[PDB]
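=== Structure Prediction Worksheet ===
Name of assembly: unnamed complex
Input type: mixed (protein and possibly other molecules)
Chain count: four
Listed entries:
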Amino acid sequence: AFFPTPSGSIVTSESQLFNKPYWLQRAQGHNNGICWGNQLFVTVVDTTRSTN
Amino acid sequence: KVVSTDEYVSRTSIYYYAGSSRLLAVGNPYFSIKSPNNNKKVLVPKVSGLQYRVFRVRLPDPNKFGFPDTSFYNPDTQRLVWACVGLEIGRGQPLGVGVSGHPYLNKFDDTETSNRYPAQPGSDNRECLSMDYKQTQLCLIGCKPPTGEHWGKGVACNNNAAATDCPPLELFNSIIEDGDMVDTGFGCMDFGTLQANKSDVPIDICNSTCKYPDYLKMASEPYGDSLFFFLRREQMFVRHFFNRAGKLGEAVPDDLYIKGSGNTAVIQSSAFFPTPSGSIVTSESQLFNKPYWLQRAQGHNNGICWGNQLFVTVVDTTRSTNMTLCTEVTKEGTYKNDNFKEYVRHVEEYDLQFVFQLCKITLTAEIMTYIHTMDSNILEDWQFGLTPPPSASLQDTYRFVTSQAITCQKTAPPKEKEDPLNKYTFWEVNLKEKFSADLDQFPLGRKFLLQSGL
Amino acid sequence: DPNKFGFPDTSFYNPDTQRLVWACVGLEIGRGQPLGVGVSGHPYLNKFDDTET
Amino acid sequence: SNRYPAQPGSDNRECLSMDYKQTQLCLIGCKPPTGEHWGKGVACNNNAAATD
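=== Predicted Assembly ===
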């Protein structure tokens, strides 16, 4: 019964995903950004700002 | 109500280059060495590739210039100010990263392949080790020196609680003076107060306050006089895994692990820490020896440098090589160990070029309000809105100053106290007597004319 | 030297009040070997101990 | 790690193996292609060659 270990790699600012603009001219679904109920739901997951 | 900076100045049709000399900087990359007999007598200053190199130019005043053509400038109402349009950071050293490391590092074990029970106790297990740092390259420009936060101490509060004993935490934004340390992957925090063992971090950091550029606060500044234009590029990854050596106060809760016995009756540490290291450092992803034609700033100040001065900050670890000196004491014919005294030195090389464009400001009375609510100090250096000083006649006149009609005469007030920024050690560069008007005699004005589309 | 060239045509070149010079416009570096890194080493290098782990 | 006194021995040959470089090339010709290699030749047998 075996299991390996995950180990990560290097992390650059060149291939980041934050502090950059976004414009939603056309979404994928049918709601084009119309937020019902006067609320939003944003979720973000990072692991690269996680010093101890 | 704020406004942008393209509606009350005007670009002229004249351009100026100025350029510094080649900067020299040498020292020891581990500690400053003072006198044994005195504290303030430095011998070799501590400079490495890990210091926030902060230069501050002093561009000469425009209104002290006398032109043969006095047509474009009105001295009755208009004034001048300088603007930055082109800029250069020069580097002249071979590429290579240096190593640092504390000789008494708080490494208990290594925790990556095998740590066999039982633990190895003993009240002293610090040892010597060394490692690479997180490589970093970035640059900032502005007319106000850049701000920086850090993590620090503080009061928790009053003793209503009787829960535990753990230190508090609080951020503090400060002014980034020169000589301060760059982060390398161990928290933007002061190790001089938050740590007590002084035996976990290499020696360059342990009595420092390593800070980090707050991009968020500077962008959220109203006038925007602290971020003209900036880049950054950095990377890191892991090297090993170690663990601390001490009683972990915040112990592991009981339900989340099955207790052992016999050889497995004691619990080891649960505080781990990795060691960072840079990757390959190419010459392709360099950030300097390249022109920067500023077109439009992200703030509102579009290059107008109030106060006739600029601030450049730059950090680089890719030229952090370490020269190892080796001299002897007694000449032998056979090898010895006590016959050599060694030293370690680190060099540093910089250069700066600048392209300036002067600008006139029509001064009507509604605009100088907007200058006044910017800050009051700009308007007085132009000597524009002042008061007539009253108080005509005095009689403090005596023919003989050392006599017996004494009034105990005292003079020399401290009235030339004007600079609030004098509490921070910058790197001054004298640029007042280094101008010229012929751009085509320089290795950057030739690059300027090809970019201008003339 | 360019001035030692007796040209068959003289109608483009006055030797009394002109001279000639050369200039590079083409440039090439030729290699002819397999690729490989060399290694050297001191037989008495000043290594005291290890300091990695 | 070569912390050392001298080491004796008559033969110290061992069993080793390693890979080589990956290398892709192709070429088309009218004449069959010509290459080169280094090799031994004349020695000119003169001037006190104390090195073989």
